[PDB]
Design a protein around this ligand. Structure first.
Ligand SMILES: CNC(=O)c1cn(C)c2ccccc12
Ligand SMILES: [Zn+2]
Length: 140
């Protein structure tokens, strides 16, 4: 689990979105595993605007933050899971690291702020859904 709270937006894994999230929908993309919903109280997170490939992510299943190198947000094939069929996920970044399904929502952060959230993984690899192209998250 986990979310990004950027102003009056809540950014979660589409596959973990609640009824309240869907009842307050701002934007969703199955191809990106992202859903954004509206909030009433403002959040304590800032979004990175950058092309950093190094950062730190939170891994719930180790209670540990790990420094990682990660790929550029790309269109990449992801093996079938409980939540999606074998498909290409868009705006995705891969790192070498530990990840389990419930680690989804863990933040990846760089010097510029929040890069993305844990989404995909397997075989000692962790995948993060990028949010840095979502400029509209920063306004209105
Ligand atoms: C759609 N979410 C998932 O199913 C997964 C997310 N992470 C990080 C995994 C790691 C190993 C295996 C499956 C997943
Ligand atoms: Zn950065």
């Amino acid at each position: 689990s986990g979310a990004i709270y950027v102003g009056n937006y809540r950014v979660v894994n589409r596959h973990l979105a609640t009824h309240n999230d869907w009842a307050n929908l701002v934007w969703e993309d199955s191809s990106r595993d992202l859903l954004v919903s509206s909030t009433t109280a403002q959040g304590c997170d800032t979004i990175a605007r950058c092309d950093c490939q190094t950062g730190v992510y939170y891994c719930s299943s180790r209670r540990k933050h790990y420094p990682v190198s990660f790929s550029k947000p790309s269109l990449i094939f992801v093996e079938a899971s409980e939540y999606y069929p074998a498909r290409y996920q868009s705006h995705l970044m891969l790192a070498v690291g530990h990840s389990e399904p419930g680690d989804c929502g863990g933040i990846l952060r760089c010097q510029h702020g929040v890069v993305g959230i844990v989404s995909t993984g397997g075989n000692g690899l962790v995948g993060f859904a990028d949010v840095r192209d979502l400029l509209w998250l920063d306004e209105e």
